[PDB]
Structure 1
Amino acid sequence: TTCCPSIVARSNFNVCRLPGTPEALCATYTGCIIIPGATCPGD
């Protein structure tokens, strides 16, 4: 699952993933975090 700390981070993460770019490269650039099993926090 991908968890993003803001709407802007989500739209950034989506744009970064477009070419099929590794999920952890885009997660690190945007502040999103990839976690095993869908469950996001108070962010």
Structure 2
Amino acid sequence: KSCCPNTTGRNIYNACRLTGAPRPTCAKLSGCKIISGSTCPSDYPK
């Protein structure tokens, strides 16, 4: 899944996405990152 440091980062990432902006751009606007793994590491749990 998608892997964000904080709730606020998940929120911005999500707001970027909802306003139809592409995933990688939103990922770096937020500072999230993306894995295959169902759960993310302890530092990017959201």
Q: Which runs of 5+ in 2 are unaligned?
A: none
Q: Which runs of 5+ in 1 are unaligned?
A: none
* Structure 2 residue aligned with 1:39: 39
Q: Which runs of 4+ in 1 moved over 3 A?
A: none
Q: Percent identity?
A: 49
Aligned length: 43
CA-to-aligned-CA distance 1:12-35 (integer Å, 9 cap, x gap): 101010122111000011111011
* TM-score, length basis structure 1: 0.82
User: Matched residues in 2 for 1:21 and 1:36: separation?
Assistant: 21
* Structure 2 residue aligned with 1:18: 18
